[PDB]
Design a protein around this ligand. Structure first.
Ligand SMILES: Nc1ncnc2c1ncn2[C@@H]1O[C@H](COP(=O)(O)OP(=O)(O)NP(=O)(O)O)[C@@H](O)[C@H]1O
Ligand SMILES: [Mn+2]
Ligand SMILES: [Mn+2]
Length: 337
């Protein structure tokens, strides 16, 4: 009852060349060298790219795998070195349409800004019109709180409690968040605000590798107010070993179910097809009042901690994308639901 296989498309991996750009920290966390070993066994060449060096000489490349997210974010902040790297990368990609990029920079850029990403998820969900899915109201606050803040929140469907997150979606200075419970709590901007959804303190990290995904359960904020706003760093909340009073559920309340694979599949397809990403995660929580799936976070090329099949899935996705290119499997028109 696994019906999709890759043995045949894996036969074309021989002689293919894969370039990757990952930070040394990410190479370590992934044990990416072990993936490189796996590919060599199928007759692939894998090489780490150096974006300080002309890229022509480093190719030909059939595929590039990267996580340039933070270099892009630095280049956005006018870091001269990062700009140089991105320009070089971009020049090369532009010159080599035959090179499959996992994932395209336009796709990456969508996930760099929380508000933009949440709006894309909202639009995608409106298009899918599945009553099993909900988009928590969200908005971006740019001005410091004041006399009009309450009415601004209200007209955008923001309610207490809501969680405050940075607009920048990754890197240094992206993990500090707040939960605001009442009007007095409104000193906690700029930031994105998103209605807090009680979900019985279980996060379902959907780790997507192209055509396959793995769901990994993580600790998550408890259910919840004259109380002081809560400030926390998301590093401390939803890691495998995370444990704190913020994630200790008092008791199961309301609807408590696991996510629907049918729903995850439709979300995965729609996000992949609309945005062009393939190596990403979406964080799903199950609303305890409605049972609906809420996507509260989307991340380009995350850690995949707990995804033991990550390497074989990655290899299968490289085989698939090569198969797609070889047979001109380009999508046309709108996302086909
Ligand atoms: N709208 C929400 N309702 C309820 N809980 C939430 C909501 N948004 C975030 N959380 C919780 O807060 C945690 C951190 O929020 P998240 O937006 O995933 O941060 P992040 O820094 O982008 N995490 P990650 O990229 O997965 O390392 C989540 O794992 C949930 O436990
Ligand atoms: Mn998250
Ligand atoms: Mn995130």
């Amino acid at each position: 009852k696994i019906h999709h296989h890759h043995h045949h498309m894996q036969t074309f991996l021989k002689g293919k060349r894969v370039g990757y750009w990952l930070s040394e920290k990410k190479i370590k966390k992934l044990n990416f060298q072990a993936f490189a070993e796996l590919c060599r066994k199928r007759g692939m060449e894998v090489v780490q790219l150096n974006l300080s060096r002309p890229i022509e000489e480093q190719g030909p490349l059939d595929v590039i795998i990267h996580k340039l997210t933070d270099v892009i974010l630095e280049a956005d902040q006018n870091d001269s070195q990062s700009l140089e790297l991105v320009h070089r990368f971009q020049e090369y990609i532009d010159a080599h349409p035959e090179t499959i990029v996992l994932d395209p920079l336009p796709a990456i850029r969508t996930l760099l800004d929380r508000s933009k990403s949440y709006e894309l998820i909202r639009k995608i969900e409106a298009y899918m019109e599945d009553d099993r899915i909900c988009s928590p109201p969200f908005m971006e606050l740019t001005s410091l709180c004041g006399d009009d803040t309450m009415r601004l929140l209200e007209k955008n469907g923001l309610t207490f409690p809501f969680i405050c997150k940075t607009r920048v979606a990754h890197g240094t200075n992206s993990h500090e968040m707040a939960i605001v419970f009442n009007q007095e709590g409104l000193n906690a901007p700029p930031c994105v605000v998103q209605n807090f959804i009680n979900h019985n303190a279980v996060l379902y990290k959907v780790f997507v590798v192209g055509e396959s995904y793995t769901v990994v359960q993580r600790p998550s904020l408890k259910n919840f107010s004259d109380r002081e706003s809560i400030f926390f760093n998301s590093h401390n909340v939803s890691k495998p070993e995370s444990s704190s009073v913020l994630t200790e559920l008092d008791k199961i309340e309301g609807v408590f179910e696991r996510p629907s694979d049918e729903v995850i599949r439709e979300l995965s397809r729609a996000l992949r097809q609309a945005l062009g990403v393939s190596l990403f995660g979406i964080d799903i929580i199950i609303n305890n009042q409605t049972g609906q799936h809420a996507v509260i976070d989307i991340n380009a090329f995350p850690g995949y901690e707990g995804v033991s099949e990550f390497f074989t899935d990655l290899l299968n996705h490289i085989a698939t994308v090569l198969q797609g290119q070889s047979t001109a499997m380009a999508a046309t028109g709108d996302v086909a639901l």
